[PDB]
Assembly symmetry: D2
Homo-oligomer: 199 residues x 4
């Protein structure tokens, strides 16, 4: 069973002017394509090392597995977290959870923006669900370290703050990118992920 690059759910220019078409095409067709391919190569090497009991080889593969596997995990969620139909505020139970856990939607936006801008180097800001506590939680992750695999939190909304996610359009001004991306957040998808967490 081989991982595959999911198609983007919209056209490359569908998020303009907030994220331009050149970024979207590079981010999906170059960056994510590389994560998927490198992940499949690493998984095959890991299976061979596992069959031989070569623990040294398994451990040597860990950085590539986490970076490319995390890349596949994170970007697969990210594309569904964005939409030309996005923006605005969520509704229903997700909005009530946001108000309850963060005070208000705007306070939530400030907290997730702060986590995202606060990443030094490459990384991600996340809104997650803490299954044990039964409430929302914000965390930042370094590089491609994925949220569920490294924290146990269920990913609801992720913000990529690798420079390749914004640099062509916003250059060094990452806060301008964070300002723009709220306009294309697919709250329908974040709600779907949130409702799946509760039963």
């Amino acid at each position: 069973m081989k991982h595959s690059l999911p198609d983007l759910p919209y056209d490359y220019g569908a998020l303009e002017p907030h994220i331009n078409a050149q970024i979207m095409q590079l981010h999906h067709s170059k960056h994510h394509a590389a994560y998927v391919n490198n992940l499949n190569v690493t998984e095959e090497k890991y299976q061979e090392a596992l069959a031989k009991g070569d623990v040294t080889a398994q451990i040597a593969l860990q950085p590539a597995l986490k970076f490319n596997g995390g890349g596949h995990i994170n970007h697969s969620i990210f594309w569904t977290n964005l939409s030309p139909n996005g923006g605005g505020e969520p509704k229903g139970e997700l909005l009530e959870a946001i108000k309850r856990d963060f005070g208000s939607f705007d306070k939530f936006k400030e907290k997730l923006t702060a986590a995202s801008v606060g990443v030094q180097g490459s990384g991600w800001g996340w809104l997650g669900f803490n299954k044990e506590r039964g409430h929302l939680q914000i965390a930042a992750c370094p590089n491609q370290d994925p949220l569920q695999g490294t924290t146990g939190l269920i990913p609801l909304l992720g913000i990529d703050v690798f420079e390749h996610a914004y640099y062509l359009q916003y250059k060094n001004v990452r806060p301008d990118y964070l300002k723009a991306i709220w306009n294309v957040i697919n709250w329908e998808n974040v709600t779907e992920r949130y409702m799946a967490c509760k039963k």
Copy 2:
């Protein structure tokens, strides 16, 4: 005593076509300027925390100090490591050390390229001098972690592989950037740093 942003030793377009003028101007006047300012802010906070014996505050400042202080250290070296008069091969004792420690100049280039391309996320590749062993050594550093402060090796030549160092021109293809940068390496400066290591 306040750290200051050093002027670039050449014009913004002096490294074209290998690194374009837009990158050089952003890299120096935006990125490095921010490292210097954030470093001075962090040092002042650290002095206040030290005077109060607030160890919690000192430790909370460590990520900003290492990232921005390392940024200042690394980029101050980087600008002198590049030159419109660069390229080619070093001469004299540095060239002999390279041949002795790495086999050949081309083998050295392969090793430093591999360390630089191998950085997952943001970071730097370095040629350093090991004072204890009295020979050259290649290392990679994550994010802005500076070479001497984190490994003890004396920096001779650094390659910035943060995406902001290349993305506008080379997009995702970091190996194309590594290929181009050999044309502007200031071997006169790397030789100066190397000869200072020996006495």
Copy 3:
């Protein structure tokens, strides 16, 4: 400011049989004494580095500062978290918060035990207060990384799971140490720290 080794709030054997006297004496008079001594030396080197603008030296000193400074922070709290008059359950608002945030006192004990037993290598388990969220939160920290300095959470109760905290008595069986330590938790002190977090 010259940090000092705090006097223990009880004699070394006051926590027997749950933590034996030899451990308490070594832990305070050798391990914590070393954190304090190393912290003072490192702080003096940082004052010198700041006066010279030596950023390389500041960064090279960071691991010693975090390990010994964190050691001083963590153990100063730890001694006050324990008492010969301790054990049992908290009362009042802290007990209500524990039931609310973790389900029950017994479930809280399972969660903090699991976090503490789960540390691979040296580290700490913590019950903290999240000031932003206004509720309790459990976290683990590697090595001596202090809770507030690295996470912002306010420490309420810490469990040292460095091997020196238990090995002489419990050897490799860290779970037996975790079970025993509940008998000497100073819930009066933890309640004080919790009430200080609220207006």
Copy 4:
């Protein structure tokens, strides 16, 4: 492949008085046994995750795999690095390499001691062989991070500085443990590992 706890090449008391029998028995029959048991369980979970394409599970298993897998790697080498017939100095080409790369045997001992005493928290000191450079190299590793899997260096001689390696006998005084262990270094084994590195 089901990993197994290797038999010790000697009885638990064979390294006395330098490492006492209680430590050796605990270290092998409890600590290393646990690495093996935890490694086999984790490998089975990784086989299941690979079959399902569960990348989140693969990444969540990485800390346990590196800690217990590294533990298995490191301790399997460690037992062979020690002997009741050990101590003294190596001879032949290994001794020549030590004098060449470190100045003298005594200077090498100082460097490996300093690296081992310098580990903050749990970890290992190593003498390794750098295959690319064709010479000896000293490195420290955090926790159970194995030398070859994380650095590419081939392990020749390892010094465990987890507290369980020395605490029962030497308490906090890790330098006394480092001085004593030179009396039981199996230089015959280290020489074998060194000669295997060369054509």
